[PDB]
Amino acid sequence: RPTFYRQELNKTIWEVPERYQNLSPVGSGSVCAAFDTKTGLRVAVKKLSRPFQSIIHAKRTYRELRLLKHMKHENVIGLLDVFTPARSLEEFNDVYLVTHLMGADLNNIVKCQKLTDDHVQFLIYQILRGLKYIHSADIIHRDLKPSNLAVNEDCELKILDAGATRWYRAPEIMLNWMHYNQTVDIWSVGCIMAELLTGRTLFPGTDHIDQLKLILRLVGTPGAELLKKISSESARNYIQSLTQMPKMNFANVFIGANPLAVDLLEKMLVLDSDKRITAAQALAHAYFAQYHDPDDEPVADPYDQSFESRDLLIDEWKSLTYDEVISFVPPP
Ligand SMILES: Cn1nc(C(C)(C)C)cc1NC(=O)Nc1ccc(Cl)cc1
Ligand SMILES: CCCCCCCCO[C@@H]1O[C@H](CO)[C@@H](O)[C@H](O)[C@H]1O
C-alpha cells in the first residue's frame, strides 16, 4: 500500500495514491484528469459509482475490472492501474481505474474538422483493428459510437465504453432480437464511417421508431432471404405491412467518396447480419491497402467469461472483484 490522500472534487470524495496529482474533473462513475508522477504522463482516473449496491451492480463492477484487465491492444482502452484505499476485504467499498488520458473523442474531430479520405482510412482502419481483437475474445461492444472512440493529435485511436446514443445501433438491437452476432459492431462502424466521409450523421433518428424508418429508407425493407430467417410470426407481420422501401444505391448516396469506401460501406450496412463483413475481412479490404499489415493485427488471449452465467451474492462478486485488484500486474 502506497500512501493515499483525500480530496473533494464536485461534492465527491477522492482517495488516491500520492502517485496521482493535479486532479481535475472531466466527467460524471466520475472521471478526473491527473498527473502520474511515477511516469510523468497525464492519466484519466475513474472512481466507480456505487460499485456494490445491488447484485447486478456488483456483477457489472466485476465484469468491468475483468474486461479492462484483459484488454491489451493499441486500439483498445488499457488499464494502467487499479487501486482501492481499502486495507482489507472488509474495508473494500471503492474501486478506481486508471488509463491513458486521450485529449479528445471522434465527435469533436468530425464536428469542426472536415476529414480527408486518408483521415477516414486511418481512423476506420484502427477501429477495425481494435474490433478484430475485441471480437477474437468473444466480446461484443454493442454501443460503438464516436464518443466511445478516443483519438490523439496523431489521429491514433482507441475504443472504449464510457458507459446521440442510438444513431449507431444495429437494427436487430432496436428490435430486441436478443441474439446478436458480433457484426452489430460492424453496423456501428458503417455509421461512423459514413459520417466521417460526409460530415453528417447517417441516421439521425428523433426517437426509436424514426431511427428504424431512416435505416430502412437507405438499405430497404428486408428481402426474401432475410424474411425467410425470422422465426417470430409477429416480427414478420410487423415488417411485411410497412411500405416496401427499395434498397438505395450507395454510390448515389455518398457522392464525393472513394469508390472503395462506398464498396466497404455496402458490405457493412447490410440489414442481414449474417451477410455483414467481419472485422478481420474488413481489414483486408482494398480501402485500407496503405495501412493493412496482416502480421500486425493481433488477436486476444482466451477470455474466460463463464462468470456471465453465474448468479452470486453481492459479497461474493465483491470478493471476486477484490481478488482481481490484488492480482493486477501493471503494463511495461
Ligand atoms: C465496459 N467496457 N468495454 C470496453 C471495450 C468493449 C471497448 C473493451 C471498454 C470498457 N470499459 C471502459 O472503457 N471503461 C472505462 C473506464 C475508465 C475510463 Cl476513464 C473510461 C472507460
Ligand atoms: C425491420 C426489419 C429489420 C430486420 C433486421 C434484422 C436482421 C438481422 O440479421 C439477423 O440477425 C440475427 C442475429 O441476432 C441472426 O440470427 C439472423 O440469422 C440474421 O439474419
Side-chain angles (χ1 to χ4, degrees):
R1 189 184 203 267
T3 87
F4 282 71
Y5 76 87
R6 292 111 282 271
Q7 182 175 34
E8 169 153 293
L9 280 170
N10 287 337
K11 301 268 270 283
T12 315
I13 167 248
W14 285 67
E15 305 184 55
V16 303
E18 39 162 47
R19 184 176 168 169
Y20 305 110
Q21 303 258 76
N22 289 308
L23 266 82
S24 51
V26 171
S28 286
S30 43
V31 181
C32 281
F35 184 77
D36 185 3
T37 51
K38 288 194 89 206
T39 66
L41 320 142
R42 288 169 204 66
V43 295
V45 190
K46 190 192 192 193
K47 181 185 184 177
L48 255 40
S49 189
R50 315 277 284 172
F52 308 121
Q53 201 215 1
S54 63
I55 277 170
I56 299 195
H57 258 40
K59 187 179 180 159
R60 186 168 300 120
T61 289
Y62 178 68
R63 163 189 296 123
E64 171 79 338
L65 223 210
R66 282 298 305 287
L67 274 163
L68 290 185
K69 283 183 68 180
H70 197 71
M71 297 300 88
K72 298 180 182 203
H73 182 102
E74 290 160 11
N75 308 117
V76 184
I77 185 155
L79 228 201
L80 257 28
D81 197 16
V82 54
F83 62 81
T84 184
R87 272 251 29 108
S88 76
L89 195 244
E90 293 73 29
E91 312 219 48
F92 194 49
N93 256 293
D94 295 281
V95 186
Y96 298 74
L97 312 168
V98 186
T99 189
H100 292 98
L101 196 65
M102 285 200 160
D105 64 60
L106 231 205
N107 61 239
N108 276 130
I109 308 304
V110 75
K111 106 297 166 207
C112 68
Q113 327 169 215
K114 182 66 195 208
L115 301 177
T116 298
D117 190 48
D118 183 70
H119 291 345
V120 183
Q121 4 187 320
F122 188 43
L123 287 160
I124 300 307
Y125 173 79
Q126 292 183 90
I127 304 180
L128 291 167
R129 188 171 175 258
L131 233 36
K132 163 174 187 197
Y133 177 87
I134 307 307
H135 291 170
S136 76
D138 208 22
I139 300 167
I140 306 175
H141 198 295
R142 298 183 185 84
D143 202 19
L144 252 203
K145 67 194 170 182
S147 73
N148 279 161
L149 301 160
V151 189
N152 74 20
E153 117 279 26
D154 289 340
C155 272
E156 299 176 314
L157 163 162
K158 45 195 91 215
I159 308 173
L160 63 156
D161 188 340
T165 45
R166 45 96 203 294
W167 296 341
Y168 311 91
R169 199 109 67 207
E172 61 267 52
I173 301 181
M174 295 188 307
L175 295 163
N176 227 60
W177 230 257
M178 237 291 138
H179 288 61
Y180 322 137
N181 97 288
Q182 320 180 295
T183 50
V184 298
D185 289 333
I186 291 296
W187 182 270
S188 303
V189 181
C191 294
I192 292 155
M193 180 168 159
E195 175 169 356
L196 305 186
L197 285 172
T198 70
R200 278 169 87 302
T201 315
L202 180 60
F203 303 122
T206 58
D207 52 36
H208 231 257
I209 208 274
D210 191 54
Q211 194 59 38
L212 197 77
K213 296 192 333 212
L214 295 187
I215 289 175
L216 300 176
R217 280 169 76 188
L218 176 78
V219 302
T221 40
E225 188 189 34
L226 200 176
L227 291 169
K228 214 165 284 161
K229 300 184 221 185
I230 302 166
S231 154
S232 152
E233 131 270 302
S234 58
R236 225 156 41 236
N237 281 260
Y238 186 61
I239 288 157
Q240 287 168 355
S241 282
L242 282 158
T243 283
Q244 208 163 359
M245 304 278 140
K247 198 239 155 205
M248 283 192 183
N249 311 296
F250 285 33
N252 293 339
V253 173
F254 298 100
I255 292 311
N258 193 328
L260 290 169
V262 181
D263 185 66
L264 181 59
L265 281 170
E266 292 208 295
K267 285 166 169 63
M268 297 171 153
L269 297 175
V270 184
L271 222 49
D272 187 352
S273 79
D274 299 330
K275 299 332 193 82
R276 255 118 78 176
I277 195 162
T278 69
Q281 291 163 351
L283 288 172
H285 190 278
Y287 188 48
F288 304 115
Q290 299 324 113
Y291 293 107
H292 176 44
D293 183 338
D295 304 312
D296 200 14
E297 290 160 356
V299 296
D301 289 345
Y303 181 53
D304 177 346
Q305 38 189 334
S306 52
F307 77 88
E308 287 295 7
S309 67
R310 246 101 74 186
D311 296 327
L312 314 176
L313 276 11
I314 288 167
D315 299 304
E316 298 176 317
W317 290 120
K318 172 192 262 202
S319 172
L320 255 13
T321 304
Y322 188 71
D323 290 343
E324 293 294 327
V325 174
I326 270 78
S327 60
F328 182 72
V329 171

